[PDB]
Structure 1
Amino acid sequence: GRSRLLEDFRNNRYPNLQLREIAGHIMEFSQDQHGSRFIQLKLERATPAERQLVFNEILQAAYQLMVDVFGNYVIQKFFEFGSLEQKLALAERIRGHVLSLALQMYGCRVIQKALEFIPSDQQNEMVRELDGHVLKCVKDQNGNHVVQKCIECVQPQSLQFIIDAFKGQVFALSTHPYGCRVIQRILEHCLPDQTLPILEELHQHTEQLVQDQYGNYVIQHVLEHGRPEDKSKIVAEIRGNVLVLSQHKFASNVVEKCVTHASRTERAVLIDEVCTMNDGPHSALYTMMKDQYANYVVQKMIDVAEPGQRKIVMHKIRPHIATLRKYTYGKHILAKLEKYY
C-alpha cells in the first residue's frame, strides 16, 4: 500500500523531483530503498529551509526510522549534514534508547554515526546508558560495534565502566569473536591505568591466548603496537617454546610477530633457539623446515636475522638441502636459501 507519488517515483516518472515536492511524504520515502536514496542524495546540497522541512517530518517518528532497513541512512545523513540544533535534537530522541538501538540491526548504525558528530557532552551521556550492560553489548553482533565506536570516539575518561566490566573477563572476551575486537580498540585508545589491568590478565594467559583462533590476534596486537615491557614478557613466554608454537596453526603467527617486534637481543636469542634445540633424534631446525606452519616462522627468521646471524642460520640449513627438496613445505624454505647461498 504505497502512495501515488512514491509509486510514480519508483517507476521513474519524476526525473526532477525536489525535497519541497515530497513534503507530507518524507516518512514514507525514507522507508523505501529508493525514496531514501533520493533523500540521502539531496540533503547535502539542499537549502537550510529544505532540510528543516525534511527534519520537521523525521523528528516525530525518528526512532521508527532509526531501526528501519532504509530509514537509518536518512537519520545518519542528518548527523552528517544537519545543523548543530538538529544533531542535538536527535541525540535527544536517542536519549533513553541507546541500549536497545545498539542491539538493533539498524539502530546500531545510527548510534555509531551520532557518536562521530555530536559534541563530547552528548557522547558521554550516550555512553553512560551502556553502563550495566557492557558484557552484553560486547558479545552482540550489532552492539560490539557500538562499543568499539565509543572506545574510538569518546574521551577515555568516561570509559572506565567498560574497563571495570572486563575485570577478570579479559581472557573470556579475548577468545570471543567480538570480544577480541573490543579489547584491541581498548589497547589502542584507553589510558595507562586502564590498559594496565587489561594487559595483566592478557599476560596471565599468554600460553592459552596464542593458541586461540581469536586470542592470537590480541597478543599479536600487543607485539605490533605495545610497549617494550609487554613485548618482553610475551617473547619471554614464547622463548623456550619456539619449536612447538611454530607448528601450531595459530601460535605460529605469534612467534613470527615476536621474531619481528622483539628487541635486537631478544630477536637474536629467539633465532638462536631454533638452531640449538634438538627435536628428538634430529635438530629442531630440520623439524620446522618440513612443517606446514613452521616453515613460515623459519623464513621470517631468515629475513629479520642480522647478516651475522643469518649467515649461521643459512649454514645450519645447507646440510639438509637434499631433504628440503622432497618435503612439500620444505621447498619454500629452500627457495629462499637458494638465492643468497
Structure 2
Amino acid sequence: VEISALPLRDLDYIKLATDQFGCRFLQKKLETPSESNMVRDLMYEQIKPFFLDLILDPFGNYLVQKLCDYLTAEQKTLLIQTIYPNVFQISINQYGTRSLQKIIDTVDNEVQIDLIIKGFSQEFTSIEQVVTLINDLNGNHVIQKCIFKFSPSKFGFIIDAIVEQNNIITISTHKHGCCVLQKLLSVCTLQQIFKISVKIVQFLPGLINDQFGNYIIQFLLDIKELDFYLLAELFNRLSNELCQLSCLKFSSNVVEKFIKKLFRIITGFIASDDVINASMNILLTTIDIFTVNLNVLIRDNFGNYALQTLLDVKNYSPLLGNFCNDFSLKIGNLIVLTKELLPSIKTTSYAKKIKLKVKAYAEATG
C-alpha cells in the first residue's frame, strides 16, 4: 500500500506488527530474499523491548512465528533471554502458546533450551502453575512440545510437579492432563516412570474408576519394563475389591486389560520366571474370585465383559508345568458353572455370547 513506498529503515515496525495488514506485510518482506536479512535486522532491534508484547498479540504472534525461521542464533538467544521468566503467562495465553511452541520448535542449541527450562523451574514458575499448564487448554500444547522436542534430562519441572502431594490425581483425572501424562510416559526414562508409578499406585483408588484415570492405569499395563513390580502391586491393592471394580463402568476395562496381560505372558512362556510365576498365581487367584462372584458378574452390565474376557478360550488355548493342571481344574469348573447359569440370564441381550464361549471351550477340550 502506501507503506510499500517508504525505505525499510523508516518503518515503525511495532505499529505494523500489531496490525493485520502490517503484520502480513512484514512476513512477506521476510520472504523477500533482497529484503530478508535487512528487514529482520531492522525489525529485531526496534521490537526487541516489545518481545513479550508481540508474543501475546493476535497479530504479533504471527510475525514472531515467521521470524523464528530467519533469526540467527544470537538473535534467537537474546529473544529467549528476554522472555524466559514469562513462560507461564505465555503458555497460558491463546496467542502466546502458538509463539512459544514455534520458538521451542526452532531452537538452535542447549543454551537456548536451558534458558527455556530455567523459566519453567520453581524460580519463575511454581509447581501449582506447572500443574495448571498441564491441565490448561493452551498450556498443555507447550508441555507436549517440550516433551517431544527436548530430552528427558530436562523433564525435571514436569516430573517434580506430578509427584508432588496428590497432583497425580489432579492431572490424571483431567481431560488435558491425562493426555500429557500419556505423552510423557511414551518418551520418559525408566526411573522417571517409576517415580510417577509410585504416586499412581499410592492414589490408585482415585484413578482406577475415573473416566480418564483408568486410561493411565491401562497405559502402565503396556510398559513391559514394569511387569516385575506392577502386577503384584496392583493386584494386592485391588484383589478384595476386584468384583466391585469389574462391575464399574470405567474400572472394568482395566480389569479386562489386566486379565489379558496375564494371559499374554503365560502364553508367551509356552518375560521372567519371577514375573511368570507371579502371573500364574494371580491368574489362578483371579479365577477363584470370578467363580465365587460368578452369580453377580454374569448379570452385571459391566461385569459380564470381564467374565467373557476370562472365559474366552481364544486367550488361553495353549494352556490346555504343574500350573496347567490346576488351571484347567479351575477354568473348567468355571465353564461348567457358567453353563448352569445360562437359563438364569436369558432375559439379557448377551446370553448368546456367553453360551458360545462355553461352546468354544468344548471345541478345544475334547
Q: Which residue of 2 aligns with 1:298?
A: 307
Which residue number corresponds to residue 57 of structure 2? Answer: 68
Q: What amino acid is aligned across from residue 218 of structure 2 in structure 1?
A: Q
Preserved contact between residue 170 and residue 202 of structure 1 (Cα < 8 Å)? no
Q: CA deviation at 1:201?
A: 2.2
SS in 2 for 1:298: helix
Report deviation, 1:224: 1.6
Question: Is this contact kept in 1: 2:247–2:300, CA < 8 A?
Answer: yes
Matched, 1:231 2:230: yes
The partner residue of 2:89 within 89, 100, 107 is 100
AA in 1 matched with 2:115: E
Structure 1 residues 29-71: Cα deviation after superposition (integer angstroms, max 9, x where no partner): 765678767877x589653743652574366043333212344
- Equivalent-residue separation in structure 2 for 1:336 and 1:278 (angstroms): 15
Task: Report the Cα distance in structure 2 between the residues aligned to 1:296 and 1:81, rounded to whole angstroms.
Answer: 57
Deviation, structure 1 residue 210: 1.0
Gaps in structure 1 of 5+ consecutive residues = 7-16
1:111 counterpart letter in structure 2? L
Give 2:339's aligned residue.
318
Q: 1:321 to 1:32 in 2, by over 3 A?
A: farther
Shift of 1:107: 0.9
The match for 2:118 among 106, 123, 128 is 128
Taking structure 1 as reference, are residues 210 and 47 closer, same or farther at Cα in structure 2, changes over 3 Å only? Answer: same
CA deviation after TM superposition for structure 1 residue 200, in Å: 2.0
Return the TM-score normalized by structure 2: 0.69
- Partner in structure 1 of residue 131 of structure 2: 138
Please say if 1:154 is aligned against 2:150: yes
CA RMSD of aligned residues (A): 4.0
Distance in 1, Cα, partners of 2:205 & 2:159: 23
Change (3 A) 1:196 1:67: same
Counterpart amino acid of 2:103? A
- Write the distance in 1 (CA, Å) between the matches of 2:119 and 2:198: 28
Aligned counterpart, 1:195: 193
CA drift of 1:126 comes to: 1.0
Corresponding letter in the other structure for 2:53: Q
Q: Which runs of 5 or more residues in structure 2 are unaligned?
A: 267-275, 321-326
* Structure 1 Cα separation of the partners of residues 357 and 44 of structure 2: 63
1:276 aligns with 2:285: no
Amino acid at match of 2:303: A
* Distance in 1, Cα, partners of 2:43 & 2:208: 53
CA distance change for structure 1 residues 238 and 32 in 2, over 3 Å: closer, same or farther?
farther
Q: For the residues of structure 2 that align with 1:86 and 1:335, how far apart are their CA atoms?
A: 69
Paired residues in the alignment total 321
TM-score, length of structure 1 as denominator length: 0.73
The residue correspondences of 1:197-276 to structure 2 (distance < 5 A) are 197-225=195-223, 226-232=225-231, 233-262=233-262, 263-264=265-266, 265=276, 272-273=284-285, 275-276=287-288
* Alpha-carbon contact 1:127-1:150 (below 8 Å) kept: no
CA drift of 1:136 comes to 1.4
For residues 8-30 of structure 1, the C-alpha deviation after alignment (integer angstroms, 9 at most, x for no partner) is: xxxxxxxxx9xx99x94876676
Match of 1:169 in 2: 166
SS at match of 2:209: coil
1:267: Cα distance to partner? 5.6
* Cα-to-partner distance string for 1:225-276 (whole Å, 9 max, x where unaligned): 2522343222443445432111112211211221233432566555555543
Percent of aligned positions that are identical: 25
SS in 2 for 1:328: coil
Output aligned runs, 1:83-122, within 5 Å.
Answer: 83-118=72-107, 119-122=109-112
Residues 1:193 and 1:35: Cα distance change in structure 2 (over 3 Å): same
